[PDB]
From a paper:
Human [name] is a C-type lectin-like ligand of [name]-P1 (CD161, gene KLRB1), a C-type lectin-like receptor of natural killer cells. Similarly to mouse Clr-g, human [name] is a type II transmembrane glycoprotein which consists of an N-terminal cytoplasmic chain, transmembrane and stalk regions and a C-terminal CTL domain with two predicted N-linked glycosylation sites. In this study, we present several structures of [name] under various conditions: monomeric ([name]_mono), dimeric deglycosylated after the first N-acetyl­glucosamine unit ([name]_D1 and [name]_D2) and dimeric (packed into hexamers) with homogeneous GlcNAc2Man5 glycosylation ([name]_glyco).
The dimeric form follows the classical dimerization mode of human CD69. The protein used to obtain the [name]_glyco structure contained homogeneous GlcNAc2Man5 glycosylation, while the protein used to obtain the [name]_mono, [name]_D1 and [name]_D2 structures was deglycosylated beyond the first GlcNAc. [name]_glyco, [name]_D1 and [name]_D2 share essentially the same structure at the level of the dimer; however, they differ slightly in the mutual orientation of the monomers within a dimer. In contrast, it is 173.7° for [name]_D1 and 177.7° for [name]_D2, both of which crystallized in space group P212121 with one dimer in the asymmetric unit. The dimeric interface in all three [name] dimers is based on a hydrophobic core formed by phenyl rings, analogous to that observed in similar CTL dimers: Phe121, Tyr125, Phe89, Phe87 and Phe82. Additionally, there is an interaction formed by π-stacking of arginine residue Arg124 of both chains, and a pair of His190 residues forms a partial stacking interaction in the termini region (the part of the CTL domain oriented towards the cell membrane). There are six common hydrogen bonds that connect the monomers in all three dimers: AGly81 N–BGly81 O, AArg124 N∊–BTyr125 O, AArg124 Nη1–BLys126 O and the three analogous hydrogen bonds with exchanged chains. Additionally, there are some hydrogen bonds specific to individual cases: one additional hydrogen bond in the dimeric interface of [name]_glyco, two hydrogen bonds in [name]_D2 and six in [name]_D1. As an example, residue His190, localized near the C-terminus in the dimerization interface, is charged at low pH and destabilizes this part of the interface. It is apparent from the structures that His190 is neutral in [name]_D1 and [name]_D2 (pH 7.0) and is close to His190 (3.1 and 3.3 Å) from the opposite chain, participating in a partial stacking inter­action.
Author numbering:
A (entry chain B): 72 to 192
B (entry chain A): 70 to 192
The structure:
Amino acid sequence: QAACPESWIGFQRKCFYFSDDTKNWTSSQRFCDSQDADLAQVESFQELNFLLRYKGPSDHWIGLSREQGQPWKWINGTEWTRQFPILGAGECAYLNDKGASSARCYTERKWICSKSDIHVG
Amino acid sequence: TGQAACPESWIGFQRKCFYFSDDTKNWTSSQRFCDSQDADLAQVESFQELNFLLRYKGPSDHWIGLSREQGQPWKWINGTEWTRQFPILGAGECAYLNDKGASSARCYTERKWICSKSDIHVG
Ligand SMILES: *[C@@H]1O[C@H](CO)[C@@H](O)[C@H](O)[C@H]1NC(C)=O
Ligand SMILES: *[C@@H]1O[C@H](CO)[C@@H](O)[C@H](O)[C@H]1NC(C)=O
Ligand SMILES: *[C@@H]1O[C@H](CO)[C@@H](O)[C@H](O)[C@H]1NC(C)=O
Ligand SMILES: *[C@@H]1O[C@H](CO)[C@@H](O)[C@H](O)[C@H]1NC(C)=O
């Protein structure tokens, strides 16, 4: 039994999907959720550097959002742990070529989903 | 619970694990390195695998695990003929991936390399 779904990319105990199309942040989340996954929950610098190597030049949504004055939260609503900086004053995070940035959630970008591999309890 | 499908520093794709080198070696020394890790120079088995390697590898040329006798069909490391899933340019004896596709050169040239092997959940 494969650790990751067909055409997804395996790194450590996680599985990643890089989109071909563009969507706004919420619709990308809906796509990831339909496949038992979330917008990429990036948990370490190593993970970030893996994603940046693969992603290519397009901006890619990840699974961090905030209310404008509040801290960044993971998809589950837990406050995120600041493993890398995020540029800007936007409500929705994405990966550009230098790291993490932010934008209005209604903009259309490619996206990354992540999920644990199936052999995780 | 369980264990990672691939070793640390290897990337998973379609039931295999891939290692992208940071150093350079000739084709035979690159293969010796892969062998030490129970792996082979990448046995590229699809157009989708080709695209995956081109996308992850970066700007450097990387050796892969196809070779041929000068004038004959490309062979995998196990000696059996390759199925021709894409073009391989050039008149060289040993295959590699450049910035755009698959090409070929003299086996003594020093380049980055890619190893592949099956993930642990195979069998
Ligand atoms: C919420 O999600 C993040 C990233 O997936 C994880 O690190 C964190 O522990 C989670 N907290 C929960 C489920 O309480
Ligand atoms: C987000 O995308 C969906 C799907 O295309 C669309 O229905 C919706 O209007 C979008 N939201 C905004 C604010 O444009
Ligand atoms: C030779 O290698 C190719 C590519 O990995 C594969 O199709 C075939 O199974 C191999 N032959 C063996 C293991 O006998
Ligand atoms: C490849 O390079 C190594 C240096 O590590 C050298 O020892 C070896 O003989 C070379 N062999 C071939 C076949 O090119």
